[PDB]
Amino acid sequence: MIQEQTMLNVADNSGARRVMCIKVLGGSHRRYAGVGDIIKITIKEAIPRGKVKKGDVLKAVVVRTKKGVRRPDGSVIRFDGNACVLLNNNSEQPIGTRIFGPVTRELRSEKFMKIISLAPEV
Amino acid sequence: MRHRKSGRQLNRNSSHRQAMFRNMAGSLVRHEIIKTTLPKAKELRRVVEPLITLAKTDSVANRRLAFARTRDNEIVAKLFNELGPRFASRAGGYTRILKCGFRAGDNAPMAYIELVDRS
Amino acid sequence: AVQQNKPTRSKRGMRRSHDALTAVTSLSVDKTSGEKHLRHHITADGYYRGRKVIA
Amino acid sequence: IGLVGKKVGMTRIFTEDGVSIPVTVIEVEANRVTQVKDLANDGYRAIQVTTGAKKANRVTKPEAGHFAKAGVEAGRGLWEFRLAEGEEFTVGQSISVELFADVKKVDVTGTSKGKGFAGTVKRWNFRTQDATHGNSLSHRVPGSIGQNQTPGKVFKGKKMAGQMGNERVTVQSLDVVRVDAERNLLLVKGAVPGATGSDLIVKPAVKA
Amino acid sequence: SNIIKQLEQEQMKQDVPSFRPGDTVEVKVWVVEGSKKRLQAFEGVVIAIRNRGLHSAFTVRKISNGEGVERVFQTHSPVVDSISVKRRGAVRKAKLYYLRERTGKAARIKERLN
RNA sequence: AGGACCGAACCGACUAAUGUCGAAAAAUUAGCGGAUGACUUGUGGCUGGGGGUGAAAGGCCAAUCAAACCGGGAGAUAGCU
RNA sequence: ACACAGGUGGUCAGGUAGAGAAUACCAAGGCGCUUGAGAGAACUCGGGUGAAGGAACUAGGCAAAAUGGUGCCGUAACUUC
RNA sequence: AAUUCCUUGUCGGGUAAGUUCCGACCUGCACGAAUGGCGUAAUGAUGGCCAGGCUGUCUCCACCCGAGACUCAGUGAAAU
RNA sequence: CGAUGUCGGCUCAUCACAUCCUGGGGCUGAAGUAGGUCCCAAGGGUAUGGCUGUUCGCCAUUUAAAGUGGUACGCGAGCUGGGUUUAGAACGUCGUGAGACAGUUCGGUCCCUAUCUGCCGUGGGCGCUGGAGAACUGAGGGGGGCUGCUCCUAGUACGAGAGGACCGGAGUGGACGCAUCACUGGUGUUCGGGUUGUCAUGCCAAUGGCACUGCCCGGUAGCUAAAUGCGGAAGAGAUAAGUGCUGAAAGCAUCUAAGCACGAAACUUGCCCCGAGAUGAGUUCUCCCUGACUCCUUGAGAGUCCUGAAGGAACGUUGAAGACGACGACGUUGAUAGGCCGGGUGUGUAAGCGCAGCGAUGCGUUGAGCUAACCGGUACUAAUGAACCGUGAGGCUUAACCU
Ligand SMILES: [K+]
Ligand SMILES: [K+]
Ligand SMILES: [Mg+2]
Ligand SMILES: [Mg+2]
Ligand SMILES: [Mg+2]
Ligand SMILES: [Mg+2]
Ligand SMILES: [Mg+2]
Ligand SMILES: [Mg+2]
Ligand SMILES: [Mg+2]
Ligand SMILES: [Mg+2]
Ligand SMILES: [Mg+2]
Ligand SMILES: [Mg+2]
Ligand SMILES: [Mg+2]
Ligand SMILES: [Mg+2]
Ligand SMILES: [Mg+2]
Ligand SMILES: [Mg+2]
Ligand SMILES: [Mg+2]
Ligand SMILES: [Mg+2]
Ligand SMILES: [Mg+2]
Ligand SMILES: [Mg+2]
Ligand SMILES: [Mg+2]
Ligand SMILES: [Mg+2]
Ligand SMILES: [Mg+2]
Ligand SMILES: [Mg+2]
Ligand SMILES: [Mg+2]
Ligand SMILES: [Mg+2]
Ligand SMILES: [Mg+2]
Ligand SMILES: [Mg+2]
Ligand SMILES: [Mg+2]
Ligand SMILES: [Mg+2]
Ligand SMILES: [Mg+2]
Ligand SMILES: [Mg+2]
Ligand SMILES: [Mg+2]
Ligand SMILES: [Mg+2]
Ligand SMILES: [Mg+2]
Ligand SMILES: [Mg+2]
Ligand SMILES: [Mg+2]
Ligand SMILES: [Mg+2]
Ligand SMILES: [Mg+2]
Ligand SMILES: [Mg+2]
Ligand SMILES: [Mg+2]
Ligand SMILES: [Mg+2]
Ligand SMILES: [Mg+2]
Ligand SMILES: [Mg+2]
Ligand SMILES: [Mg+2]
Ligand SMILES: [Mg+2]
Ligand SMILES: [Mg+2]
Ligand SMILES: [Mg+2]
Ligand SMILES: [Mg+2]
Ligand SMILES: [Mg+2]
Ligand SMILES: [Mg+2]
Ligand SMILES: [Mg+2]
Ligand SMILES: [Mg+2]
Ligand SMILES: [Mg+2]
Ligand SMILES: [Mg+2]
Ligand SMILES: [Mg+2]
Ligand SMILES: [Mg+2]
Ligand SMILES: [Mg+2]
Ligand SMILES: [Mg+2]
Ligand SMILES: [Mg+2]
Ligand SMILES: [Mg+2]
Ligand SMILES: [Mg+2]
Ligand SMILES: [Mg+2]
Ligand SMILES: [Mg+2]
Ligand SMILES: [Mg+2]
Ligand SMILES: [Mg+2]
Ligand SMILES: [Mg+2]
Ligand SMILES: [Mg+2]
Ligand SMILES: [Mg+2]
Ligand SMILES: [Mg+2]
Ligand SMILES: [Mg+2]
Ligand SMILES: [Mg+2]
Ligand SMILES: [Mg+2]
Ligand SMILES: [Mg+2]
Ligand SMILES: [Mg+2]
Ligand SMILES: [Mg+2]
Ligand SMILES: [Mg+2]
Ligand SMILES: [Mg+2]
Ligand SMILES: [Mg+2]
Ligand SMILES: [Mg+2]
Ligand SMILES: [Mg+2]
Ligand SMILES: [Mg+2]
Ligand SMILES: [Mg+2]
Ligand SMILES: [Mg+2]
Ligand SMILES: [Mg+2]
Ligand SMILES: [Mg+2]
Ligand SMILES: [Mg+2]
Ligand SMILES: [Mg+2]
Ligand SMILES: [Mg+2]
Ligand SMILES: [Mg+2]
Ligand SMILES: [Mg+2]
Ligand SMILES: [Mg+2]
Ligand SMILES: [Mg+2]
Ligand SMILES: [Mg+2]
Ligand SMILES: [Mg+2]
Ligand SMILES: [Mg+2]
Ligand SMILES: [Mg+2]
Ligand SMILES: [Mg+2]
Ligand SMILES: [Mg+2]
Ligand SMILES: [Mg+2]
Ligand SMILES: [Mg+2]
Ligand SMILES: [Mg+2]
Ligand SMILES: [Mg+2]
Ligand SMILES: [Mg+2]
Ligand SMILES: [Mg+2]
Ligand SMILES: [Mg+2]
Ligand SMILES: [Mg+2]
Ligand SMILES: [Mg+2]
Ligand SMILES: [Mg+2]
Ligand SMILES: [Mg+2]
Ligand SMILES: [Mg+2]
Ligand SMILES: [Mg+2]
Ligand SMILES: [Mg+2]
Ligand SMILES: [Mg+2]
Ligand SMILES: [Mg+2]
Ligand SMILES: [Mg+2]
Ligand SMILES: [Mg+2]
Ligand SMILES: [Mg+2]
Ligand SMILES: [Mg+2]
Ligand SMILES: [Mg+2]
Ligand SMILES: [Mg+2]
Ligand SMILES: [Mg+2]
Ligand SMILES: [Mg+2]
Ligand SMILES: [Mg+2]
Ligand SMILES: [Mg+2]
Ligand SMILES: [Mg+2]
Ligand SMILES: [Mg+2]
Ligand SMILES: [Mg+2]
Ligand SMILES: [Mg+2]
Ligand SMILES: [Mg+2]
Ligand SMILES: [Mg+2]
Ligand SMILES: [Mg+2]
Ligand SMILES: [Mg+2]
Ligand SMILES: [Mg+2]
Ligand SMILES: [Mg+2]
């Protein structure tokens, strides 16, 4: 259940280590994002060499949440770390060529099929 | 709002509430009859009747439970010896409630509570 | 907080109409002793439903 | 038309493919038609029905007679349903739950669970005032209730504190899962008003 | 009541293996990818069990690639194919939510062998 | 050794809430500062009203202070209500 | 002004834990605070716990939460050393 | 600038965004040398700002435990 | 002026239309996409942040949109007190000085238990014309009315290309609302366990008290949101702007003067709730009551005895009902509460005894013991025979027809 000011570990290998959520897109007065929703990200801590330098506003997709995701069978998947993959604002599609950690089924929706191919599990 | 919710509070904090019943059990088991307020007496059924049923199976652990509750060897001695065998055929309803007017000093509905025997 | 100007005898009457407490009008009669008492309460001597259950 | 039925809690149905759907269990015993109100006598066409059972002593002569006119057992409570012009029913006729075997979506109507005297925060979803930051004796209070000397009054239908629940409400277009004939059940999806044991006027969904 | 208990006790499968908490358990799960019907596996420690008949469930924790993944299965769902127990651990609590904080060496648990 | 350090008694009174016809004409609860010194406290003295005293605020001088209180001039005076 | 949650100097100093006249639980001894009895709505007051987030609150992190002991390793700028 | 009006001066730093803050510039309406000027370690229930940690402060309120509120009996005010 | 508390924020709103979005239209320098302006339209909806006391503004990022106003520049007997206006202090400037300055700076008590109106709830009284119990009808009143993105038609019309639809159909989101606890969680001082200090039960063991529930770990029922369902409608009637069709006065022409047809989230219904005190007190159904007598201002007169039904109240046991009333269930011809019994759940292998080990401790009987609000049975306890209220065919004037 990610929202404004929430800090996320980054799943991809783009360059960012910690990224702060600044806004949840897709509808006015929208409180939270989860599962595989789009958020607006600012980068608060980067690695030295990376593709994306510090203090750069860009979009991202949530991949894991501590509160977790429900499936049709009344069954939940909780993680131990809120996390996201970075994206290229108007272009979309991820920056990082490799993705760390698992991702949900409910992320599978055409535009993120690149993430699931590169991701290791689920 | 207390839907399905059991247990009278009696304008007392838990630790106190739990003690006064522990006293009133010891009061009731020894004398075999009490006057108290009608609510207090109604809630006193849920403490005393278990101790009477626990006293049917005369074992050690049951003595140690009947002593964990109550907290008196005398009362434990009046249980098990008398009230264990005296309430055997009777399967429940060991105590009886009888309303006895109003407590003069504060108009509180009084009630006799006593064990079903008196003989 | 505070009244603008005082109420009357009438209003004060109107309000008190409901304060009139009801009587019992429902006295029992104990089967054996024939003494009067509140329903489901014991008698002052010491009876309830024709059986002595008090010292 | 519609059937009266007692609510018997909620469970769920695991559909063979995977999905677990939450269902309310409504026991719907044979609704016996007592009185057929007609345009000739009353000025509107309708039927009066009943279900369950009372004791032959708790029921009052006024109603014990009322049933004896029809020639049925004294069911607990009485309800009334409107006919749909072309329909026509007879007195002393049982209505089983097999009416809903055809239809898919239904309206359930029952009395909600009483919350008693609820505040504005609970009843009307008023926002609670600042829990600290100087605040004095006004966290969950409603704040202002009007303007000033212009209206000089509080307008009607103001959202204030008072009674919440214990009022009749309809939940609309719930999907029926199963319609059991043997034990007289009806398994509607989702949650319906009133606690276990409360009565429910179930009827076919109006919004077709 | 009888009316619910008739409907619940019907749907419950009559072939569940009796597992305790702190047991390492591989749970085979059905997944659908349009027309396909795949069996996933999901090995992990059973952190907690919840018994309510048809509504029963259990939480399994795994520490897969990267971070921890706590998954909650509805025991009597058709999606859970089989619950194969591996090691059964001697813990003396019902819920093992203290395994959220511990990782690696602290997270490992004694075996029963009873 | 120290107008040293932390910290009870004791002395103070920074924040907050409570109370605001109060439990109380300045307090309570939770924290807060000093705590061998320019410390604090008991007892008894001295300083008196244009006077005292004041690490100075016009602070304090008996719940009263940019001039106390009680009595007297005195029924001050009031183009005002 | 009251049988008023406030003010009032000196003396005596038990036990177990503790650095201690802190604190906890007890002794000797003394009290249960002079309206009670019910119910267990909003709301107020003093508290407890809280998913996911973690100052986005607000004039301001006010208030809460947090840190907290003892022994040892280690401890930067700057410095009147 | 505890001094700056014009003003949120301009440039830089910090922030996704900074009328506050830190550094610099001089155009000092109206600093300035014992009514002291500029530095300054240590000290502050001191003023401003930022970063960790921690949190019901907040998103967004939920439940719970006590004291009142509510009913019964006794006593019984007040401002107006 | 014998006091009408002045900015801003919070909470709570409400109205206007000079409309920001959504809706309907004309003209376009309208090919389509998107616009531009004007007309009709007030049903609903209408940011979160950074800076500053701010209103405003600027900036960042969203949105379908981030409307303009009124309401004592709405709302301090609803909250705040950052700002402005008390007393302290300082800077700059002005003044010989006391002091002064919409100049700046640091600090600075926000009182009130609601009589009346109003409002949200909730009863009692009488009425509704013989009394009682039900179930309706519906005058009237209230709630609700937001909307994105994604496909299909279709890469079709349009367009040299780039780009790219109208009109209809489907799915899935946000915000808001209603319900609910099966799921996911929270809570759970009334259940189980671990544990620190210390007292107590003679002591060991085992328990209990107290330390915020001493600290913690799980947690049943309930309540509940972050959890899961459902909702806004489609449809008709009458319309606005607008569009028209026949058609004179005006041998033509014109949407109109007669006549006739379309035409919007507005209006009236449809959906939901309250609702016959709707005194205009409506209806249908059922139930209950059919005895004498003097007195006489012979009056819808008043009493005397005889009769008191339907029903109701009270009292009790009580409830997923509830501040109190009220509302529902039950009162022995009885499952209303408590108990008990059997589960279920929860916690996690009790106590004692035996063996292992020097001891802490371990192991076996043992998934044991203990289990609140849960489910199903069982009259063991408590719901009393009666007394209380409530009566004895129901006025008159007209009218339609059986003796
Ligand atoms: K004179
Ligand atoms: K044992
Ligand atoms: Mg109960
Ligand atoms: Mg009391
Ligand atoms: Mg205690
Ligand atoms: Mg036993
Ligand atoms: Mg047993
Ligand atoms: Mg015990
Ligand atoms: Mg007046
Ligand atoms: Mg008067
Ligand atoms: Mg009057
Ligand atoms: Mg209720
Ligand atoms: Mg708020
Ligand atoms: Mg204050
Ligand atoms: Mg407060
Ligand atoms: Mg208040
Ligand atoms: Mg107030
Ligand atoms: Mg010192
Ligand atoms: Mg300290
Ligand atoms: Mg002082
Ligand atoms: Mg008060
Ligand atoms: Mg302390
Ligand atoms: Mg101190
Ligand atoms: Mg200190
Ligand atoms: Mg110091
Ligand atoms: Mg002296
Ligand atoms: Mg002298
Ligand atoms: Mg001095
Ligand atoms: Mg001065
Ligand atoms: Mg003064
Ligand atoms: Mg003078
Ligand atoms: Mg003077
Ligand atoms: Mg004079
Ligand atoms: Mg003069
Ligand atoms: Mg006293
Ligand atoms: Mg006192
Ligand atoms: Mg001792
Ligand atoms: Mg001591
Ligand atoms: Mg002490
Ligand atoms: Mg002793
Ligand atoms: Mg002694
Ligand atoms: Mg003693
Ligand atoms: Mg004494
Ligand atoms: Mg004394
Ligand atoms: Mg007292
Ligand atoms: Mg309470
Ligand atoms: Mg509270
Ligand atoms: Mg806390
Ligand atoms: Mg805790
Ligand atoms: Mg917490
Ligand atoms: Mg939290
Ligand atoms: Mg927890
Ligand atoms: Mg947490
Ligand atoms: Mg802020
Ligand atoms: Mg804000
Ligand atoms: Mg300050
Ligand atoms: Mg603080
Ligand atoms: Mg808190
Ligand atoms: Mg905490
Ligand atoms: Mg604290
Ligand atoms: Mg704590
Ligand atoms: Mg050591
Ligand atoms: Mg930056
Ligand atoms: Mg700048
Ligand atoms: Mg500067
Ligand atoms: Mg400079
Ligand atoms: Mg130059
Ligand atoms: Mg100069
Ligand atoms: Mg100077
Ligand atoms: Mg200077
Ligand atoms: Mg000089
Ligand atoms: Mg000088
Ligand atoms: Mg000089
Ligand atoms: Mg200087
Ligand atoms: Mg200097
Ligand atoms: Mg200096
Ligand atoms: Mg310095
Ligand atoms: Mg310096
Ligand atoms: Mg200081
Ligand atoms: Mg400031
Ligand atoms: Mg900041
Ligand atoms: Mg911080
Ligand atoms: Mg009273
Ligand atoms: Mg008086
Ligand atoms: Mg006046
Ligand atoms: Mg204002
Ligand atoms: Mg208009
Ligand atoms: Mg409409
Ligand atoms: Mg803004
Ligand atoms: Mg005003
Ligand atoms: Mg104006
Ligand atoms: Mg104003
Ligand atoms: Mg105001
Ligand atoms: Mg006002
Ligand atoms: Mg101020
Ligand atoms: Mg302040
Ligand atoms: Mg201030
Ligand atoms: Mg100021
Ligand atoms: Mg201050
Ligand atoms: Mg106030
Ligand atoms: Mg309407
Ligand atoms: Mg729409
Ligand atoms: Mg739980
Ligand atoms: Mg707990
Ligand atoms: Mg316990
Ligand atoms: Mg117990
Ligand atoms: Mg343990
Ligand atoms: Mg001892
Ligand atoms: Mg001893
Ligand atoms: Mg020992
Ligand atoms: Mg003790
Ligand atoms: Mg104590
Ligand atoms: Mg204590
Ligand atoms: Mg404490
Ligand atoms: Mg205590
Ligand atoms: Mg605490
Ligand atoms: Mg605790
Ligand atoms: Mg306990
Ligand atoms: Mg304990
Ligand atoms: Mg601690
Ligand atoms: Mg603690
Ligand atoms: Mg013509
Ligand atoms: Mg619409
Ligand atoms: Mg029972
Ligand atoms: Mg069995
Ligand atoms: Mg069993
Ligand atoms: Mg179990
Ligand atoms: Mg064992
Ligand atoms: Mg134990
Ligand atoms: Mg043993
Ligand atoms: Mg053992
Ligand atoms: Mg039990
Ligand atoms: Mg118990
Ligand atoms: Mg039970
Ligand atoms: Mg039962």
Curated annotation (Swiss-Prot), chain A:
<dbReference type="InterPro" id="IPR000218">
    <property type="entry name" value="Ribosomal_uL14"/>
</dbReference>
<comment type="function">
    <text>Binds to 23S rRNA. Forms part of two intersubunit bridges in the 70S ribosome.</text>
</comment>
<dbReference type="GO" id="GO:0006412">
    <property type="term" value="P:translation"/>
</dbReference>
<dbReference type="GO" id="GO:0003735">
    <property type="term" value="F:structural constituent of ribosome"/>
</dbReference>
<comment type="subunit">
    <text>Part of the 50S ribosomal subunit. Forms a cluster with proteins L3 and L19. In the 70S ribosome, L14 and L19 interact and together make contacts with the 16S rRNA in bridges B5 and B8.</text>
</comment>
<keyword id="KW-0687">Ribonucleoprotein</keyword>
<dbReference type="GO" id="GO:0022625">
    <property type="term" value="C:cytosolic large ribosomal subunit"/>
</dbReference>
<dbReference type="InterPro" id="IPR019972">
    <property type="entry name" value="Ribosomal_uL14_CS"/>
</dbReference>
<keyword id="KW-0689">Ribosomal protein</keyword>
<keyword id="KW-0699">rRNA-binding</keyword>
<dbReference type="InterPro" id="IPR036853">
    <property type="entry name" value="Ribosomal_uL14_sf"/>
</dbReference>
<dbReference type="GO" id="GO:0070180">
    <property type="term" value="F:large ribosomal subunit rRNA binding"/>
</dbReference>
Curated annotation (Swiss-Prot), chain C:
<dbReference type="GO" id="GO:0005829">
    <property type="term" value="C:cytosol"/>
</dbReference>
<dbReference type="GO" id="GO:0000027">
    <property type="term" value="P:ribosomal large subunit assembly"/>
</dbReference>
<protein>
    <recommendedName>
        <fullName>Large ribosomal subunit protein bL32</fullName>
    </recommendedName>
</protein>
<comment type="similarity">
    <text>Belongs to the bacterial ribosomal protein bL32 family.</text>
</comment>
<dbReference type="GO" id="GO:0000302">
    <property type="term" value="P:response to reactive oxygen species"/>
</dbReference>
<keyword id="KW-0687">Ribonucleoprotein</keyword>
<keyword id="KW-0689">Ribosomal protein</keyword>
<dbReference type="GO" id="GO:0009314">
    <property type="term" value="P:response to radiation"/>
</dbReference>
<dbReference type="GO" id="GO:0002181">
    <property type="term" value="P:cytoplasmic translation"/>
</dbReference>
<dbReference type="GO" id="GO:0005737">
    <property type="term" value="C:cytoplasm"/>
</dbReference>
<dbReference type="InterPro" id="IPR044957">
    <property type="entry name" value="Ribosomal_bL32_bact"/>
</dbReference>
<dbReference type="GO" id="GO:0022625">
    <property type="term" value="C:cytosolic large ribosomal subunit"/>
</dbReference>
Swiss-Prot record, chain D:
<dbReference type="Pfam" id="PF00297">
    <property type="entry name" value="Ribosomal_L3"/>
</dbReference>
<dbReference type="GO" id="GO:0003735">
    <property type="term" value="F:structural constituent of ribosome"/>
</dbReference>
<dbReference type="GO" id="GO:0002181">
    <property type="term" value="P:cytoplasmic translation"/>
</dbReference>
<dbReference type="GO" id="GO:0019843">
    <property type="term" value="F:rRNA binding"/>
</dbReference>
<keyword id="KW-0689">Ribosomal protein</keyword>
<comment type="function">
    <text>One of two assembly initiator proteins, it binds directly near the 3'-end of the 23S rRNA, where it nucleates assembly of the 50S subunit.</text>
</comment>
<dbReference type="GO" id="GO:0000027">
    <property type="term" value="P:ribosomal large subunit assembly"/>
</dbReference>
<keyword id="KW-0687">Ribonucleoprotein</keyword>
<protein>
    <recommendedName>
        <fullName>Large ribosomal subunit protein uL3</fullName>
    </recommendedName>
</protein>
<dbReference type="InterPro" id="IPR019926">
    <property type="entry name" value="Ribosomal_uL3_CS"/>
</dbReference>
<keyword id="KW-0699">rRNA-binding</keyword>
<dbReference type="InterPro" id="IPR019927">
    <property type="entry name" value="Ribosomal_uL3_bac/org-type"/>
</dbReference>
Curated annotation (Swiss-Prot), chain E:
<keyword id="KW-0699">rRNA-binding</keyword>
<dbReference type="GO" id="GO:0005737">
    <property type="term" value="C:cytoplasm"/>
</dbReference>
<dbReference type="GO" id="GO:0002181">
    <property type="term" value="P:cytoplasmic translation"/>
</dbReference>
<dbReference type="GO" id="GO:0003735">
    <property type="term" value="F:structural constituent of ribosome"/>
</dbReference>
<dbReference type="InterPro" id="IPR038657">
    <property type="entry name" value="Ribosomal_bL19_sf"/>
</dbReference>
<comment type="function">
    <text>In the 70S ribosome it has been modeled to make two contacts with the 16S rRNA of the 30S subunit forming part of bridges B6 and B8. In the 3.5 A resolved structures L14 and L19 interact and together make contact with the 16S rRNA. The protein conformation is quite different between the 50S and 70S structures, which may be necessary for translocation.</text>
</comment>
<dbReference type="GO" id="GO:0005829">
    <property type="term" value="C:cytosol"/>
</dbReference>
<dbReference type="GO" id="GO:0022625">
    <property type="term" value="C:cytosolic large ribosomal subunit"/>
</dbReference>
<dbReference type="InterPro" id="IPR008991">
    <property type="entry name" value="Translation_prot_SH3-like_sf"/>
</dbReference>
<dbReference type="Pfam" id="PF01245">
    <property type="entry name" value="Ribosomal_L19"/>
</dbReference>
<comment type="function">
    <text>This protein is located at the 30S-50S ribosomal subunit interface and may play a role in the structure and function of the aminoacyl-tRNA binding site.</text>
</comment>
<keyword id="KW-0694">RNA-binding</keyword>
